[PDB]
Amino acid sequence: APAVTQHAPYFKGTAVVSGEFKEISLDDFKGKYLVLFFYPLDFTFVCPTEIIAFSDKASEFHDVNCEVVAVSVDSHFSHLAWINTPRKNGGLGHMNIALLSDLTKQISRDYGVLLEGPGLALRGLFIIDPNGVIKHLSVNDLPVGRSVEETLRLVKAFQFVEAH
Amino acid sequence: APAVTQHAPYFKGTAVVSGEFKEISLDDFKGKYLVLFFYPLDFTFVCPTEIIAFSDKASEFHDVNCEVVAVSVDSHFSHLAWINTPRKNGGLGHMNIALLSDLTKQISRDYGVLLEGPGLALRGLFIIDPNGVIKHLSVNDLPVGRSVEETLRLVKAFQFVEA
Amino acid sequence: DPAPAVTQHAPYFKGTAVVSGEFKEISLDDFKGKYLVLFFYPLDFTFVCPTEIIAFSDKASEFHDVNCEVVAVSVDSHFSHLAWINTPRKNGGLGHMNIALLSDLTKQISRDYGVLLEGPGLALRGLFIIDPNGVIKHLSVNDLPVGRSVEETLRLVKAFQFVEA
Amino acid sequence: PAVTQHAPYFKGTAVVSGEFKEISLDDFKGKYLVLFFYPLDFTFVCPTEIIAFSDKASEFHDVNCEVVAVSVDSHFSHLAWINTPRKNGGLGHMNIALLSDLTKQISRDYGVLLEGPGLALRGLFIIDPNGVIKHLSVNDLPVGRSVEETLRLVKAFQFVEAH
Amino acid sequence: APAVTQHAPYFKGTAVVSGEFKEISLDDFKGKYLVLFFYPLDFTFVCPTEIIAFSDKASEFHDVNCEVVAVSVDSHFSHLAWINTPRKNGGLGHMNIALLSDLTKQISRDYGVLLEGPGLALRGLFIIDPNGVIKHLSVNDLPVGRSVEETLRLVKAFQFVEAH
Amino acid sequence: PAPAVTQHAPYFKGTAVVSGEFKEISLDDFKGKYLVLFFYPLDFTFVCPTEIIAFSDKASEFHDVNCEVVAVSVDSHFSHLAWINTPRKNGGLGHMNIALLSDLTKQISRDYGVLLEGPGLALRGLFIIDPNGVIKHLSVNDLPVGRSVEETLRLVKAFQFVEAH
Amino acid sequence: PAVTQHAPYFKGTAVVSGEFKEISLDDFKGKYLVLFFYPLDFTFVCPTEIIAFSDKASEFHDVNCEVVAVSVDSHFSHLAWINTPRKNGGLGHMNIALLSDLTKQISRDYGVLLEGPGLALRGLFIIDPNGVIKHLSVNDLPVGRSVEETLRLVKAFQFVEAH
Amino acid sequence: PAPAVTQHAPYFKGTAVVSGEFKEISLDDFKGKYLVLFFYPLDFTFVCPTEIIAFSDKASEFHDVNCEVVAVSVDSHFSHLAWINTPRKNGGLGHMNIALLSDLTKQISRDYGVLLEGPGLALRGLFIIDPNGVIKHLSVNDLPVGRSVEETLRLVKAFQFVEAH
Amino acid sequence: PAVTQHAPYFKGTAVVSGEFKEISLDDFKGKYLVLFFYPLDFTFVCPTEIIAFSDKASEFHDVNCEVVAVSVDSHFSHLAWINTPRKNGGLGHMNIALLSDLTKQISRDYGVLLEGPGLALRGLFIIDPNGVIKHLSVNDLPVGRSVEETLRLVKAFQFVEAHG
Amino acid sequence: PAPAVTQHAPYFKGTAVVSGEFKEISLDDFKGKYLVLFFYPLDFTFVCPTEIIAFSDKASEFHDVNCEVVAVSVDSHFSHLAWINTPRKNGGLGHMNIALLSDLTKQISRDYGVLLEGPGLALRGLFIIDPNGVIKHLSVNDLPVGRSVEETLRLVKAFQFVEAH
Amino acid sequence: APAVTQHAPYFKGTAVVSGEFKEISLDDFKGKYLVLFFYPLDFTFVCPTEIIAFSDKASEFHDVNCEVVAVSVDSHFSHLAWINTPRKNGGLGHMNIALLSDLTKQISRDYGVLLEGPGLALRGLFIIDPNGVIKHLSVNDLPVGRSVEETLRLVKAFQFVEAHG
Amino acid sequence: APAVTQHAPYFKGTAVVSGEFKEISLDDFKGKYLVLFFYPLDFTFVCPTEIIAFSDKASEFHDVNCEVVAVSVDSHFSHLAWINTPRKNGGLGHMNIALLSDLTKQISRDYGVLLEGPGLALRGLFIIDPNGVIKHLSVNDLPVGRSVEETLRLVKAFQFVEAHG
């Protein structure tokens, strides 16, 4: 279930990883931390700020054994086309994080962030620990992006607790 | 599941029409022939040929009182972004037909062309008469494009059969 | 599981056909390992049907050349098929046939393929391209009065092969 | 359908004098009807009996009796068999109605349909002016019946209703 | 069942054969053609002409390997009494065919010819082949006579088919 | 309404031979009179006639006490007439002073509980039915044994006496 | 029960030669049996018949036939009625068994029980050596039957077996 | 209503011998009086008469205190009268000052819960029923053993006193 | 319970010769038992019958018959009534067992319990050596029975086993 | 309506001994007063009188604060009276200043949750019930142990103090 | 069940013992008497008087093999902080008895003292013997405190019974 | 439901507001933004930092039309006692925000943050708009606190969207 202290719902799908298509799953992240976050749609004005900021600070998450993965109900083909749109035209440009396709909408559904009527995800974020346990979640309404720095601080606060 | 001689399932959604977002529905085509065709996904290499072929020959359909509407499970932002990608670059360029978004997937479901596992449409095509009745349908597997010329021919053939 | 739908296995069928002026029982199993075009038409001795059927018979060897058999089906008996065959083309008939004319006398084949109109008791003009593994790759259905392009059907059969190569 | 019971309803398209005409049991109210079935157009076992009924048709008409032949073939098949000359195994011109039972419901309702192959046994019904069955007989597929015997029976039922 | 191409319903009963009581059944006729026909009642005047005609023609049937059996719901004692009444007195006089009693009415019921209301048989006729398969059946309403010659023609016609 | 003593006699209707003619009769026709209703198995057999002939010879003796006699079997009324027209020398019934009722449908024997379903004929039952239609007496014999007619008359009188005193 | 069927089982206490004895249907295999019912001990309507069977009992024995009288009274009422002299309206000495049907089951299984008043009609059954009913007759309560006729029938049934 | 102390006595109706005459009597006949209703197995048995005779001899004492006594068995009323008409010296009942009630259908013995169905006779129950039909006392003996008439009478008087105070 | 049927089993605490003793129906096998019920200790209606039974206990014992009185009172109430002098409305010394039916199940199993007030009707049961009920009688609450008559019945039942 | 603090006391009604007489009492009679309702297992046992006597001796101290006291066991009211009439010297109650309620049907002990079903007597429960019939305090002791009367009066006082202040 | 004579319901949870957190459960008290009492809430003005009186007298319970445990639905962190509040300021100060936390409310529920609406316990007290059997219970409404001396007297009286009669 | 875009579930309970006990509910905040946040337990080392940070910055929320309410499963008496403990000793000190008591646990349950096992809330936070619609929620595991500046920035971002785009 998508609640804190419970194991994260299993997921699998096609992601853009480094300009390439790869099938990824929750299993691939065992033994690291994972920030899994959702955004409504590719090619919309409100999303990319948050997605880019995550890409920019990705190295910082890697440094503490934390992976980052952005998800939307769009196809992996739409993801790539948007990654190949340069930031100066409201694209994403190169990405340091995976762009998971939730084309079936099942991932968003499993994480309790899918809006069924229009068929797209709220802005959910989950911090998942090395055993697949959810330590933190937050959800924002569509117009509002989150602070990437606060996410990083939380990953660190969680690791600190584990270490002590 | 839709069938020749049966009324076409109702549909409504956001289309890109002449670079802009418009709400469209089956009712908007009463009094006219409609070609409604589905393709899998935006930004794939198997589809632009068919969609481009249809857009190029669109006025020929307009001349015989027939609209053309292309449909995929992509959002209408994906549609517009693909329209705003030059053909030389593998995009759609300017479109003379509507591109309807089936984001909820319910239109593909209703037309019986939704593949539920991957969550995208088979290449269905439906010719619907001025009364909403399906005169012709065909469906191809994902990789294979159809002939626009043959679709135009069938339309005129159904019109000939009125007289 | 078998259904007259693209990506699904074609429903089994068996019946009496006219094959080279002779009665032969044939079935879906006879066509395993090759492509099959199975198409339905409403009725023997109607003016709307022979153009399409003759066009397939005329192109039959081009279909065989790309590993594709062609089988026409109506709900008429095999005796009707044979009489229409033995009516020359100059006389409104089918004349010589290079394809199988399957009888669906019980109408069950049309039913299983989803093209039977029960009320009047005949098929719509459906066509199914079935691959060597028995999987439907393409289907199309016309209302009764309208013939289809045999050229286009041949091009599609070629294209499905091209794509699996 | 047994003797002393009312004839099942039927309706269908018939070839009547080279033309397509919708006929039904009700068209025969007030007249005798010989309704007989044969298995299939264009088979060699059937034409001898159908032609014999055609040849002797006015003799039935003379005693207020109509003759209708029925098979599960379409009316287009019936017409092609009429347009085949007798010398060529055809029916040639007909003085009796050839009824099409394409749906098979008529043969089903008259109790003569063989479901497995989907064709009718060689059944014959004598139906009085009120639509009551006075007589019935059935032969296996290969064997034709005596027309003069059927005429004799018609005349004998008429004799009995008069005396 | 009593339908063309089906096997004839099994029957058994006491018949009058050449002035004597003999129990007969459908199995007795294996290897032979059988003409099995029904009439309504003994000692009535409408039934007799048909029956005498089959009797006078019996040898023509025997010559083509065919038996003839007349059936009514009467007892076998009635059948004998009727056979023992000279024709000149309106009886059947001597018979060359079997007269089978259907006292229980079960034979006429099984052959689909019994009028339940008065409990007598319609005039039905069945030609049954050597395997017990019905090839022809006909049922006239109670008064109307039928043709021995035509029944003979039909028997021969079925045999012709069986041979060529 | 059952074939049992103290109960009303089951209704009956059928064609009888009366004075050599056909007439439909029924239980109703005997209201106000006593009736002897008796059953025998089959016309034109050698065991039934003594009883029937004996009831006929003694018939006026029953009439003298306001009592009718009706004989019943499952034979048709045509069989009944032919047997009456067969002389007694020849095993027939000869002239009859009593009605011979036909129970062709077997339903009268069934209603009177005398029908043997196996062979489809009546046991030798006898019922004495009062002027109210009430069964005062029944007996039933196995097929090969005949009844004393004089005992039946005495029983009728006995019942009348009891009523009268 | 009916003629040509096996007699229903019975068992009960009978007065036999002035002693109580348990008898049953099994005791009479090999012999004929005349089993008859009367309404009630000590009523003026019954003794005549019962007496007549007693007087004639030797004749029945001479033809291998037993006679048993049955009523729903107890065997003590039977004995008391036997010990009542004939002039005083009793039965006096008996040559036949007098079976008590206290439980009413015997009258019930023989079809002669009047349920309302709880007593038997006057039925008589002739039962053969195999326990099969050959004859039955039933009288309303006031009317006695003929013992000579009953004896005639037993003899006639014996003649039919022997020839 | 049930055969239980403090409950209303079950309803009964049947034919009794009353002063050598047949009379139909019922529980209602006894309203406003005390009623001793006792059962015994069978007429003409060696055991029973002592009890019954003892009750008859003492009957007037019961009357003096407004109490009726009714003996019941499953015998017919004809048996009862024959037993009455049999002198005491011979094992009979002789003259009777109490009613002898027949329960030929056995329903009275059933309603009073004293019938043995297997043998079809009553256990020896005795019920003291008050003027409003309420059971004040019951006793049941096995078949062979008789009852004290004197104690029954004391019990009637005891209840009468109590029900007044 | 009815005559000819086995007495229902019972067990409980009795006052026996001024002491508390558990007794059951099993204890009376091979003996006759008179089991009688009375409504309540310390009521003016019951002592006469109880005292009379006790006064005649030796006469019962001499014929191999035990006598047990039962009420729904506790055995403590029974003992207190025993220790109350006869002069004062007590029972005085008792030659019979006084059985307590505190749970009321004994009275219920013997069919004498008045459920409304929760006390027994005056039922009496003569039980033979195999525990078969030979006699029962029941009186309404105000009326006592004759001890003499009970004794006579016991001796009569014995006479019948003994002779006929 | 249940035996729990803050709920209304279950309704009761029964016959009590009150000043040497039998009176019908119920929960309703105590409306507008405080009520101490206590159970004990059995009359005439050595273990209960000390507690009952101590309540009786202090009864006027409860009266003075508008509080009634009633003892309850499953004994009849006739046992209760007889135990009152037994001197204290002989383990009796002697005279009582409190009501002794009879719970002969055991339903009161049941409704108050203190009935031991197996032996069919009450545990030593006590309930302080207020003028509106609401339970303020309950307590239960195993059979062998008596409670302090002073402590029950202190609690009654304490609940009254809380009501006023 | 929380009924006298029944085994006490099992409980487990975190208590403050001697200024420290310890898991305790019913099994810990095997061999010992246990007074388990409940109070509504930490930091309210009603409870501390009883809790403090129990702690002051704890040595008298310990001297007769008896533990005392106080329970409320508060967390063990509240308990500790109440202990760490001076008595001067309505705190508990030093405790000689354990303060059990019933944060899930399940213990007050299992002991029948949970008020579900507000989510806190009535003032129930249970004396549980060395085998885990409830010998005595009591329950007061929220505003009234019990006498500790009387609880100690009961523990002693139960031990007296165990050792003699 | 506690999901973004849905209406916040109704709540009502006792809060400490400026050192006094006050009943508050969701209705009280209509027309204002509300930050409703949950913490596990009063008097724990883990929570005060975040509670104190919200209180220290309360005036920044007030100035953008936003109230802040903290919630736990502790009673309001524990809340008040934690307020009256000095910060130097692990206390909350003076609070500028309301501390809501969730003693029944129903608020934590309705907001989907109650850990049923231990009976305390996870660290959930909800930003609720003036119409009662949830705009943002976050939940942390028990040991980790949130940034109060990030909560305030979100309140401002939602207000900004509402005012423009």
Author numbering:
A (entry chain K), E (entry chain G): 1 to 164
B (entry chain J): 1 to 163
C (entry chain I): -1 to 163
D (entry chain H), G (entry chain E): 2 to 164
F (entry chain F), H (entry chain D), J (entry chain B): 0 to 164
I (entry chain C): 2 to 165
K (entry chain A), L (entry chain L): 1 to 165
Article sentences:
PrxIII is a prominent member of the ubiquitous peroxiredoxin family that function as thiol-dependent peroxidases with dual roles in anti-oxidant protection and redox signalling in eukaryotes. Like other typical 2-Cys Prxs, PrxIII employs its peroxidatic, active-site cysteine (Cys47) to react with hydrogen peroxide forming cysteine sulfenic acid (CysOH). The resolving cysteine (Cys168) from the adjacent monomer then forms a disulfide bond with the peroxidatic cysteine releasing an H2O molecule. In this paper, we report on the crystal structures of both oxidized and reduced forms of bovine PrxIII F190L to 2.4 Å and 2.2 Å, respectively and examine some of its novel structural and enzymatic properties.
In the presence of 1mM DTT, reduced PrxIII F190L crystallized with a P21212 space group. Twelve monomers are present in the asymmetric unit forming a toroidal structure. Overall, there are 6 homodimers interacting by hydrophobic contacts to complete an (α2)6 dodecameric toroid. In this higher resolution 2.2 Å structure, a detailed picture is revealed for the first time of the precise nature of the ring-ring interactions stabilising the catenated state. The major inter-toroidal contact area comprises a network of hydrogen bonds between residues Ser59, His62, Asp63 and Glu67 from chain A of ring 1 and Pro9, Tyr10, Phe11, Lys12, Arg109 and Asp110 from chain H of ring 2. A potential third site of interaction involving hydrogen bond formation between Lys12 from chain C and Tyr10 from chain J, as observed for the C168S mutant, is absent in the current structure. In contrast, with PrxIII F190L in its reduced state, the conformation of this conserved Arg is quite distinct; instead of facing the active-site thiolate, the Arg side chain adopts an average conformation inclined away from the Cp sulfur to a distance of 4–5 Å. Interestingly, however, individual active-site geometries around the 2-ring catenane display considerable microheterogeneity in this region with the Arg side chain adopting a variety of positions ranging from 3.4 Å to 5.2 Å from the cysteine sulfur. Interestingly, the Cp loop of chains F and G of the reduced form had to be modelled in the dual conformation with half in FF and half in LU. In addition, the new Arg123 conformation, together with the lack of C-terminal structure and the dual conformation of the Cp loop at two specific sites suggests that our structure is not in the typical fully-reduced form, but may well represent a trapped intermediate state.
